[PDB]
Design a protein around this ligand. Sequence first.
Ligand SMILES: CN1CCO[C@@H](c2ccccc2)c2ccccc2C1
Ligand SMILES: [Cl-]
Ligand code: NA
Lengths: 565, 565
Amino acid sequence: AQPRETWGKKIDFLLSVVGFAVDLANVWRFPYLCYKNGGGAFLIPYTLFLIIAGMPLFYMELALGQYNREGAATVWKICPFFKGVGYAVILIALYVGFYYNVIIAWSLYYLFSSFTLNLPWTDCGHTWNSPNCTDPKLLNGSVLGNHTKYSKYKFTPAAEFYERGVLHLHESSGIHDIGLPQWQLLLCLMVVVIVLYFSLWKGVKTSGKVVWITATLPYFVLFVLLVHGVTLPGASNGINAYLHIDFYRLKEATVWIDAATQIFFSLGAGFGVLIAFASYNKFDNNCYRDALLTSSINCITSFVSGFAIFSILGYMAHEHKVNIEDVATEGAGLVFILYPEAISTLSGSTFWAVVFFVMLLALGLDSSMGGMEAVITGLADDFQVLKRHRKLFTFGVTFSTFLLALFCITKGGIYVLTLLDTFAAGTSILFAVLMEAIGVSWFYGVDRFSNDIQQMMGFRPGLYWRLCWKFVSPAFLLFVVVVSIINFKPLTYDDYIFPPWANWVGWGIALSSMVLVPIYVIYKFLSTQGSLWERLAYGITPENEHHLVAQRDIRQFQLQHWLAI
Amino acid sequence: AQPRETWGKKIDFLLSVVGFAVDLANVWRFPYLCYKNGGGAFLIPYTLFLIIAGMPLFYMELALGQYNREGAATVWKICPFFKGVGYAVILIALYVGFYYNVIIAWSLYYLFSSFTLNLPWTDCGHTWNSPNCTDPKLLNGSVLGNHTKYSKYKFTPAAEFYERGVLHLHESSGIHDIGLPQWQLLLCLMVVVIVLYFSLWKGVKTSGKVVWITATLPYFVLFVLLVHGVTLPGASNGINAYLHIDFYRLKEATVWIDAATQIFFSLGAGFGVLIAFASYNKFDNNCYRDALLTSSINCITSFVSGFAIFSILGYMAHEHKVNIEDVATEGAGLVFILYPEAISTLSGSTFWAVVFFVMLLALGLDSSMGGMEAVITGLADDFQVLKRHRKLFTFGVTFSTFLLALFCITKGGIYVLTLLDTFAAGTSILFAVLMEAIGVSWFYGVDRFSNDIQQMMGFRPGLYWRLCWKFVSPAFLLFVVVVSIINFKPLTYDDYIFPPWANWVGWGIALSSMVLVPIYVIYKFLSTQGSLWERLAYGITPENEHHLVAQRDIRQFQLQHWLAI
Ligand SMILES: CN1CCO[C@@H](c2ccccc2)c2ccccc2C1
Ligand SMILES: [Cl-]
Ligand code: NA
């Protein structure tokens, strides 16, 4: 009936892929996965996984979404057996938006609080804060003794505003007693979901105007802080902390689950967002240059964000009594605790704080928009009734996301906000790309994909990209899955330790998305009315080429198809 | 269009309406209300309300369901402006089944506990019941301290097994910290919802026979219990205190309101279950005699169960050397605490306890099945897509009920259960039956309803039923609503006062239903196109005759429509 929707501008696609790719401020936590005796801890595995796995999978997903012209779930019409990975990545993006909306609400609350002339991170006299009065210690405010306690800095006005003034984490004991949703956080989440609904109800063409500003703002906001990165007196050592060059000295380099999860979250592989954006893209486009530019921009953004966060850490280290590694505050609020501290000391703190919070809100809204749009497009392509009802389905998705986010915006919401997400996310995305690592490669065929790319544009992927799609990336993803399943440590917060049942709940939530692939395989095997050979043929052959099943001509049965690269 | 699957025999329907009528409420509440409100003078308001507003409601439910063989929601096609009441009753039935399956799981766990030879509630000492660590006294064997009210005492092994050993209420303090669902209660609830799905997966073609067993299950039990009722030493005092004629209590206003509420809650009129059950029946079934027989069976069953209840109470009082008013209590607490203890005191505790818990399961499962069949018939007849694939829709409904019942089976689920029950049931079902009576009697017309009954059974109802539908029943329902709104007391537990926000959540659910009804009203008003008179006509005129709007033959805009008796 209605033709396939397309972008209004080609530059809009390159802006939207970046506006979804900018998650390298809150999710880029180097002190979390930091080194102990290795030196290069996250940079080396980040670069390795971006080179060997990031660009190949990005290019593959882009070309697949552009050629098949379908959603994440409806692309596997090329191979109906591995169609459960579509629902898997849909659930991935849904669980991601669940906790991302809470980050957007936190950013909105901080932006609303920063409007005052006296910032809440400048004093401890209940200046829009909730201190327990047991440790209101302020270093620059009140000169005191060097009672560092390996630099316990959850008592600073910024950290107290974060975990007590915003989150109210003191009232909740942990996951066992989350409490009740906070009213101000509830209003922030309502505003966030209302903005997302008013952005996504009309379609992608409307969001094409919002992605422009939400992507152009961070480029302006980052430079004003980078120019003041090491201009501060003690912040220089921060840069000296980052350029730690170790040639042959490493402990955990080249192998890290968190690095793979971070690169897949930054690029978007394993979520359906790339496939959804490629679905609206025109048939004739250069996925190669787009993927290369996206990877380069993400790498440069990671580099500059690490430089900035380390400069802020060094400044906080020089201004206050310091333990080198623990001077900052861990968790999912790294920026919300590090940047306001340095901004308050900087002259004209109101303007810098407002601009930084506007940037953090704009990146978060765009990321959550890209995450939810993948689910919307996939479920709409799967069920044409949902295509006929765009506004109602968008409202339903946003309302479900708002209702299921109440457990993450409560008093002990953050205890869930990472843990659940983390578990699912990691396993989920791995499994997702893992299945995809087989999907286009073995069952569909690297040769057929290369031929489709050659038919799409003149240039054909060389030996490097094909060997990465067929051998390098599947083996890498299998190794990461194995090291994640075997080398699994119980999830814990800065001080709280989750009970054994929380780990089981997280693993069950991850398995809910994981088992979506074998369940659909069994469904396809049972639904087809035929012999075992006919069932296997209908499973591993495209829908358009099902007639060849009757003619007894299947390429996957012969070994020449598998051996071909 | 496949015809509606009628009942195999009329006995199935006649036994299903009885199984829906009688439940645990006719056992634990009716005798206590008889004792408190006048003793032997409680049937003067009871039978009067039954004959003037209780039987007239059952009649106007069965006839409306038989003439219009549709669901609870879809039956409002003679007046589209009241079709939102058909969703209100479905939501009410769902909210009540949310906590009724919890009492069913309680009865199932009690049966599983009584399966053993040595019952848990017999003696203390961590005999499968969590001890309060405050020297749990023997009921009266060891400690002769009974100066205080025995029912209020929670140190007996039965009460300890009820609240600590089944509810696990010691780990919770209220609705702010509920806890986690109890694993054994979760398994019991899962078995309950599984057997309910197995009974309702094919509808009345396989469910009625099931209730057949229930049709004989409690009564026979009560029968043999009544036998023990005449043999227990001390039951004479309980029998004399159950029918002690006190004609001076009929003057206080706390006797008539309680009797009216008891009648209305025990008959189950206006819950959609009656309309659903009377929909599969043929067009010639005599709903008048059926309603009269059902009401008479319900009232006689309540009366004869009060005899066994008071016989057990008198036996317990004689063994405890206390008065009848001390052991006099009501509710699930009352039964689960006192009846198992009396059975333990009775010879052959295993058989009597098993038979009592089987009677309880037969009273619970039939009521929950009737409540779920109403929602099924209401949603399946409104959305024709749900007409087919009943095995999936029933599974979805049962799974949603199981998931939304985890807040009632947890360590502090009794508070949520009481909140939902009281607020939702009372307020929402009162508003719903009031709107139903107003729409059937005033907006549709009692003369048309009498003509429909005449076409159904050959005889038109007389002036008594035509007066107890338009004047007696609406005024009665409005008076009960006014009493429930003005005499509303803050929610409270045995010792725990509910915080203000719990009452606000309960009133929020009630107001959600009571605006969802006018939400559908204004939806039908705005969705129709035309002038104001045309909108009102499309809202009030039956969908069967809509050409009268163009012909300007709307009878509802005439004085004779409202002046017809
Ligand atoms: C007549 N009936 C008696 C038994 O049925 C119960 C029920 C259960 C599930 C769905 C709807 C009603 C019930 C519960 C509370 C209040 C009144 C009633 C009404
Ligand atoms: Cl009753
Ligand atoms: Na029953």
